[PDB]
């Protein structure tokens, strides 16, 4: 992986900056923009945007047709140079930000159709005899930055079906990506929206220098 | 009152017997046809063929001027309806059947579009000043058919990363849908195709006989 950040964007608003989980994410970019070496590039992927192809009966039938040495038809060659465009920018980065709305306890669908695209055998993991195993297992970084309705801290049912985190965290892991966290801009549908905000700018600032590998410091 | 049984099929190949989970679901349905009694209404629905509505920019504003007693446009009208009509197939049923596929382990992207068309607040929950509840708590029943390249009934890291499952069968509950079983068409990478598809017969057969509530012992 290079010295590149890649943001993965799964908010259906894109850039609407009335968006907790936006604005959140922009604070963490201001923030991490100022620590950054001068090697560090950027990049963004917007799922609700961008192109980002969905598994469906042309993509399976390119995959086999892949699988057979078989010549691809025009729209068959069009979709997984797509996938694999998709597929090569996941790999160029070593830091990575998925920004999004927890609606219904999973991934926005836009962003398991983004899980489709880098999930790939002999790219990012491959199969052995006892399973599969990840293939980057080389010190990448994930940050993912969560706003939602709920409070998932309480180690109650909340916490059970955060299907989002749970879900993230094990498949970034699988794929040897370790270093993780999340921060929560959680219960924005019962504390105060400044609370919500000031709580969640505080630890992206954190997260901008641990991922930085920086420490900034003012006198009072 | 009219029975409804609600096929949700989440395949990206809708109707293709190659695929195994198809294949399974079609000998569930031959079996279920055979016991149903005359109030018995089978309805599909295809999700990758089908209209389902995802959550775009369109959907959000037009459920913010709803909750504000604005005006939609044409086009917010347009996916709130289809919305709409498939929410209100999904309360009219009480017998559902969820067809899927598991890759990358969790619900297809088009199964995540369906359930942010049936999980409505006011609709199919509620909020309370304790948290959440369930609106469907009368007794429905849930039956998904699930095949998979791995097997998930070992308990070791694949029973762990199982969320096509784990979700569902949360939502579900969540949503007062108790009665909830999965067929694992599974081990379709390692196992003998025939031994795959013979298990899974047996079990959606069982399945069937348990849902309509006549049992054939022979
Ligand atoms: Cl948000
Ligand atoms: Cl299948
Ligand atoms: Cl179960």
Redesign the interface.
Known sequence: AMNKTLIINAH???DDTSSVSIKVFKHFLESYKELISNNETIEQINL?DDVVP????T??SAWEKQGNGQELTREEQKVTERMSEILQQFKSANTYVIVLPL????????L??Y??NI?IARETFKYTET?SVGLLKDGRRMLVIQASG?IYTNDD??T??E?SH??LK??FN?LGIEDYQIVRAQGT?VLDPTEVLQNAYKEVEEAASRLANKYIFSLE
């Open positions: 259906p608003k894109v609700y969905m598994i469906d009966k993509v399976l609606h219904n306890f999973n991934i926005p669908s836009k398991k159709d899980m489709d999930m399973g709920g049912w909340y059970d079906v299907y749970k879900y094990a498949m699988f549908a």
